[PDB]
Design an enzyme around this catalytic site. Structure first.
Site, PDB file in Angstrom:
ATOM      1  CG  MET A  66     -38.890 -37.576 -12.682  1.00  0.00           C
ATOM      2  SD  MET A  66     -40.255 -38.254 -14.038  1.00  0.00           S
ATOM      3  CE  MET A  66     -41.813 -37.512 -13.081  1.00  0.00           C
ATOM      4  CD  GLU A  67     -39.016 -41.751  -9.866  1.00  0.00           C
ATOM      5  OE1 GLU A  67     -39.957 -41.471 -10.580  1.00  0.00           O
ATOM      6  OE2 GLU A  67     -38.027 -42.125 -10.198  1.00  0.00           O
ATOM      7  CG  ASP A  94     -30.665 -38.819 -20.549  1.00  0.00           C
ATOM      8  OD1 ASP A  94     -31.567 -39.719 -20.360  1.00  0.00           O
ATOM      9  OD2 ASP A  94     -30.922 -37.676 -20.422  1.00  0.00           O
ATOM     10  CD  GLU A 139     -31.200 -52.423  -9.474  1.00  0.00           C
ATOM     11  OE1 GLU A 139     -31.123 -52.164  -8.334  1.00  0.00           O
ATOM     12  OE2 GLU A 139     -30.989 -51.486 -10.522  1.00  0.00           O
ATOM     13  CB  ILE A 170     -35.420 -32.503 -17.162  1.00  0.00           C
ATOM     14  CG1 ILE A 170     -35.856 -32.111 -15.703  1.00  0.00           C
ATOM     15  CG2 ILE A 170     -34.700 -31.088 -17.842  1.00  0.00           C
ATOM     16  CD1 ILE A 170     -36.921 -31.075 -15.453  1.00  0.00           C
ATOM     17  N   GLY A 214     -30.708 -38.518 -15.774  1.00  0.00           N
ATOM     18  CA  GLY A 214     -30.303 -37.780 -16.827  1.00  0.00           C
ATOM     19  C   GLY A 214     -28.995 -36.876 -16.197  1.00  0.00           C
TER      20      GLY A 214
HETATM   21  N1  LIG Z   1     -34.085 -35.979 -18.096  1.00  0.00           N
HETATM   22  C1  LIG Z   1     -35.000 -36.577 -17.134  1.00  0.00           C
HETATM   23  N2  LIG Z   1     -35.697 -35.885 -16.278  1.00  0.00           N
HETATM   24  C2  LIG Z   1     -36.526 -36.273 -15.318  1.00  0.00           C
HETATM   25  N3  LIG Z   1     -36.467 -37.545 -14.956  1.00  0.00           N
HETATM   26  C3  LIG Z   1     -35.477 -38.450 -15.489  1.00  0.00           C
HETATM   27  N4  LIG Z   1     -35.121 -39.756 -15.379  1.00  0.00           N
HETATM   28  C4  LIG Z   1     -34.292 -40.071 -16.249  1.00  0.00           C
HETATM   29  N5  LIG Z   1     -34.211 -38.974 -17.243  1.00  0.00           N
HETATM   30  C5  LIG Z   1     -34.903 -37.939 -16.779  1.00  0.00           C
END
Ligand SMILES: Nc1ncnc2[nH]cnc12
Ligand SMILES: Nc1ncnc2[nH]cnc12
Lengths: 226, 226
Positions: free
Chosen positions: A173-174, A197, A12, A152, A78
């Site tokens: 995570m950000e 997911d 992107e 995770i 996620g």
């Molecule tokens: N399950 C997950 N846990 C932490 N960061 C993620 N980024 C994408 N999927 C994630």
């Protein structure tokens, strides 16, 4: 108006970077910021760092050096809400740290001293993002996004998060680190994440598609806010 | 040479701020940086925020705006080693996150993508800090310091840290974030922390004593380095 764009999906960032006119590249603290105009609107684009501190580092450099009016932070995440499906696009109403704990001193879980319990996304940005997503015939879901310095993967990690934040709909995570820096700089922001997911449910088929559509979403959101 | 100083204890920052000659105050992203000369040496002083992101934000501004040649990071921490006692001064040889987990992808526990497992303090700076502490008749202990966005008050949180980091001798909330930012800016640093309490064994009373000693230690280190 100058719009800061921080994207975690490399494709992107490349797609958007290549569309910037009068492109300038600024290299600071090991980061590269691209400035110029996207369809006539001034922008400052940066690829997001990984984890809270690296993301905070880049965001701080961008906010201080380019002083944008707003921040649009894109990426993938996620899903935690069971009703989500891969491909859905979540729009943050707020962001919280799922791994911050100073409760021993009276603070709410996830809240850090000197900060609100959660960081609120700007109402106007939220609405504009939701409108841009619908216009692309995509599905937008508004809600709480939580983040932490952990990928995770297992049931235990998810259980702890859903127990502490049953209302959280996505995790990554950000997001909260960027919201936190924006908060400290008093700059309105909106976090948007394509769901890669879902907790209890093809790579290219997702990433190739999500990154392209997210870039179109950003381009549309930039013009809208412009 | 220009020395960057980031301290957690409010009183230490005040004491050092009052000694700076030709003092200038810079206000950026909600932070305040004091510049000038400490006994003839160019310095840049900043009080660290609470947590990894707030700490990273301030450090990023100081490193970019002031371009220091080295970073001295002081504060207090909880002792993990059984031989540590309140009052001891831990000097980091390395800093690691006790709450980062991407082990699902081969990362050592505490290691984040894009970073080494731990951030190494400068050999020369470590030795210098150790000499300054000894010269003050205080006790310096060299070892691993771990950080995370949580206050550890025994229980399962403590056991988890001892399990994942058997070698960690001290724990607090900003050290690794600051080490991390310095790493990304390729700037030599040294982390020092006065032990305010030991695991399984008044904060303000401790602070009233440690903050003052730490300020003298810093002043001495600045001169030693100059
Ligand atoms: N399950 C997950 N846990 C932490 N960061 C993620 N980024 C994408 N999927 C994630
Ligand atoms: N035990 C501890 N855990 C986390 N942060 C701290 N700061 C001081 N002591 C601490």
């Amino acid at each position: 108006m100058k719009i800061g764009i921080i994207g975690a999906m490399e494709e992107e960032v490349t797609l958007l970077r290549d569309k910037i006119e009068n492109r300038q590249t600024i290299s600071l603290g090991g980061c590269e910021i691209y400035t110029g105009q996207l369809n006539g609107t001034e922008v400052a684009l940066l690829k997001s760092g990984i984890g809270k501190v690296a993301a905070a580092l880049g965001a701080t450099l961008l906010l201080e050096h380019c002083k944008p009016d707003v921040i649009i932070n894109t990426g993938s995440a996620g899903g935690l809400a069971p009703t989500l499906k891969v491909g859905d696009i979540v729009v943050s109403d707020e962001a919280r740290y799922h791994d911050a704990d100073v409760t021993a001193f009276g603070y709410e879980y996830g809240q850090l001293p000197g900060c609100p319990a959660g960081f609120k996304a700007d109402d106007k940005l939220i609405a504009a993002a939701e409108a841009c997503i619908a216009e692309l015939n995509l599905n937008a879901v508004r809600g709480l996004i939580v983040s932490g310095d952990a990928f995770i993967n297992g049931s235990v990690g998810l259980a702890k998060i859903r127990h502490n934040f049953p209302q959280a709909i996505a995790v990554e995570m950000e997001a909260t680190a960027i919201a936190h820096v924006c908060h400290n700089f008093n700059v309105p922001f909106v976090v948007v994440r394509a769901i890669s997911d879902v907790a209890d449910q093809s790579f290219d088929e997702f990433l190739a598609v999500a990154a392209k559509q997210s870039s179109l979403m950003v381009e549309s959101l930039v013009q809208k806010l412009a």
